[PDB]
Amino acid sequence: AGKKVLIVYAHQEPKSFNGSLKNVAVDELSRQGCTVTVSDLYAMNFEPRATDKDITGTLSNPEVFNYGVETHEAYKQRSLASDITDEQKKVREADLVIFQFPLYWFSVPAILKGWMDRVLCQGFAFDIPGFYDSGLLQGKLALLSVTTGGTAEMYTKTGVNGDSRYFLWPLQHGTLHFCGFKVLAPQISFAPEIASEEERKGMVAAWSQRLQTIWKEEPIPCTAHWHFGQ
Amino acid sequence: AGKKVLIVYAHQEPKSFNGSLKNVAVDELSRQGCTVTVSDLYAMNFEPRATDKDITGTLSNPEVFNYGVETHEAYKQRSLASDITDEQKKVREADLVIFQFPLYWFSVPAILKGWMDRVLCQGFAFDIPGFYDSGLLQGKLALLSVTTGGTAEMYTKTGVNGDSRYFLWPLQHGTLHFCGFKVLAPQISFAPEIASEEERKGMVAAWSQRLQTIWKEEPIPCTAHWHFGQ
Ligand SMILES: Cc1cc2nc3c(=O)[nH]c(=O)nc-3n(C[C@H](O)[C@H](O)[C@H](O)COP(=O)(O)OP(=O)(O)OC[C@H]3O[C@@H](n4cnc5c(N)ncnc54)[C@H](O)[C@@H]3O)c2cc1C
Ligand SMILES: Cc1cc2nc3c(=O)[nH]c(=O)nc-3n(C[C@H](O)[C@H](O)[C@H](O)COP(=O)(O)OP(=O)(O)OC[C@H]3O[C@@H](n4cnc5c(N)ncnc54)[C@H](O)[C@@H]3O)c2cc1C
Ligand SMILES: CN(C)c1ccc2cc3ccc(N(C)C)cc3[nH+]c2c1
Ligand SMILES: CN(C)c1ccc2cc3ccc(N(C)C)cc3[nH+]c2c1
Ligand SMILES: [Zn+2]
Ligand SMILES: [Zn+2]
Ligand SMILES: [Zn+2]
Minimum CA–CA partner of B112 in chain A: A110
Helical pair B17-31 and B197-211, crossing angle rounded to 10 deg: 30
Measured CA to CA, the distance from residue B99 to residue A179 in angstroms comes to 27
State which amino acid sits at residue B161. N
Residue B146 CB burial class (10 angstroms; 0-12, 13-18, ≥19) = buried
* Residues B142 and B96: beta-carbon distance below 8 Å: yes
User: Sign of dihedral through CA atoms A165, A169, A170, A174?
Assistant: positive
Tell me which chain B residues have a C-beta less than 8 angstroms from the C-beta of A120.
Answer: 105
Measure the CA–CA gap between A182 and B160, rounded to whole angstroms. 16
Q: What ligand is nearest to the CA atom of residue B73?
A: 6
Q: What distance in angstroms lies between residue B149's CA and the mean position of ligand 4's atoms?
A: 5
Question: How far, in Å, are A107, B89, B99, B182 from residue B1 at the CA level?
Answer: 36, 21, 22, 19
Angle, CA B104 vertex, CA B99 and CA B105 arms, to 5°: 130
Residue B107: phi, psi to the nearest 5? Answer: -155, -165
| CA–CA separation, A32 and A50 (whole Å) | 37
| Residues B222, B172 contacting (CB under 8 angstroms) | yes
Residues in chain A: 230
Report which of A162, A161, A167, A181 is spatially closest to residue A222, judged by C-alpha positions. Answer: A181
Residue B101: phi, psi to the nearest 5? Answer: -160, 155
Instruction: HSE, CB side, 13 Å, CA atoms: give it for residue B86.
Output: 14
Report d(CA A61, CA A41) in Å as an integer: 31
Q: Which of residues 38-77 of B touch A (CB under 8 A)?
A: 42, 45, 48-52, 64-68
Beta bridge partner(s), residue B189: B147
- Looking at the 3D structure of chain A, how many domains does it have? 1
**Among B98, B111, B194, B109, which residue's Cα sits nearest to residue B149?**
B194
Ligand nearest to C-alpha B120: 1
* Alpha-carbon dihedral B88, B92, B97, B99, rounded to 10 degrees: 0
The CATH number linked to A109 is 3.40.50.360
d(CA B6, CA B120): 14
- CA dist., res. A5 & res. A43, Å (int): 19
Q: What single letter denotes the amino acid at residue B23?
A: N
Q: What's the first-to-final CA gap in chain B, in angstroms?
A: 37
Ligand 2, pocket residues at CB < 6 Å:
A 64, 66-68, 117, 174; B 11, 13, 15-18, 20, 102-106, 147-150, 192-193, 197, 200-201, 204
Which A positions 78-107 lie with beta carbon below 8 A of chain B?
104-107
CB contact under 8 A, B109 and A68: no
Of A175, A70, A45, A166, which Cα lies nearest the Cα of A123?
Answer: A70
Q: Note whether A130 and A172 are within 8 A (CB).
A: no
Distance CA A100, CA B127 (A): 25
Q: What is the DSSP annotation of chain B? A: ---EEEEEE--S-TTSHHHHHHHHHHHHHHHTT-EEEEEETTTTT------GGGB-SS-S-SSS--HHHHHHHHHHTT-B-HHHHHHHHHHHH-SEEEEEEE-BTTB--HHHHHHHHHHS-BTTTBBTTB-GGG-TTTT-EEEEEEE-SS-TGGGSTTSSS--HHHHHIIIIIIIIGGGT-EEPPPEEE--TTTS-HHHHHHHHHHHHHHHTTGGGPPPP--SHHHHH--
| Selected residues 137-176 of chain A with any CB under 8 Å from a CB in chain B | 149, 157, 160-162, 166-167, 169-171, 173-175
Experimental determination technique? X-ray
B143 burial class (0-12, 13-18, 19+ CB within 10 angstroms)?
A: buried
**Using CA atoms, how far apart are residues A40 and B34, in angstroms rounded to an integer?**
45
Close Cβ partners of B56 (under 8 Å, ≥ 6 residues apart): B74, B79, B80, B81
Residues of B in contact with A177 (CB under 8 A): none
Ligand 1: atom nearest CA of A192 is: 32
| Strand partners of residue B142 | B97, B183
Resolution value, angstrom units: 1.9
Contact A13 B64 (CB under 8 A): yes
The CA distance from B110 to B124, in Å, is: 21
What is the C-alpha separation between A23 and A205, in angstroms, rounded?
12
- A187-222 burial, b for 16+ CB within 10 Å, e for fewer? bbbbbbeebeeeebeebbeebbebbeebeeeeebeb
- Structural domain for B48, as ranges: 1-230
- Residue A136 and residue A179 in contact, taking contact as beta carbons nearer than 8 Å: yes
User: How many contacts, defined by CB atoms under 8 Å, are there between A and B?
Assistant: 150
CA proximity to A110, closest of B161, B164, B107: B107
How many residues in total does chain B contain? 230
Q: Which atom of ligand 3 has the smallest separation from the CA of A191?
A: 3
> Could you write out the DSSP letters of every residue in chain A?
---EEEEEE--S-TTSHHHHHHHHHHHHHHHTT-EEEEEETTTTT------GGGB-S--S-TTS--HHHHHHHHHHHT-B-HHHHHHHHHHHH-SEEEEEEE-BTTB--HHHHHHHHHHS-BTTTB-SS--GGG-TTTT-EEEEEEE-SS-TGGGSTTSTT--HHHHHIIIIIIIIGGGT-EEPPPEEE--TTTS-HHHHHHHHHHHHHHHHTGGGPPPP--SHHHHH--
How far, in Å, CA of A11 to CA of A111, rounded?
Answer: 9
Instruction: Return all residues near A193 (Cβ < 8 A) that are at least 6 apart.
Output: A17, A149
Q: Which atom of ligand 3 is nearest to the CA of B68?
A: 6
Give Cβ neighbours of residue B51 (< 8 Å, ≥ 6 apart).
Answer: A12, A42, B67
Task: State whether B110 and A106 contact (CB < 8 Å).
Answer: no
Task: Give the C-alpha separation, A116 to B219, whole Å.
Answer: 32
Instruction: Give residue A66's identity as a one-letter amino acid code.
Output: N
Distance in Å, alpha carbon of B49 to nearest chain A alpha carbon: 5
Beta strand B35-40 pairing with B187-189: unpaired
What is the Cα–Cα distance from B124 to B102, expressed in whole angstroms? 27
- Which residues on adjacent β-strands are paired with residue B35? B4
Determine the Cα–Cα distance for residues A26 and A44; give it in Å rounded to an integer: 18
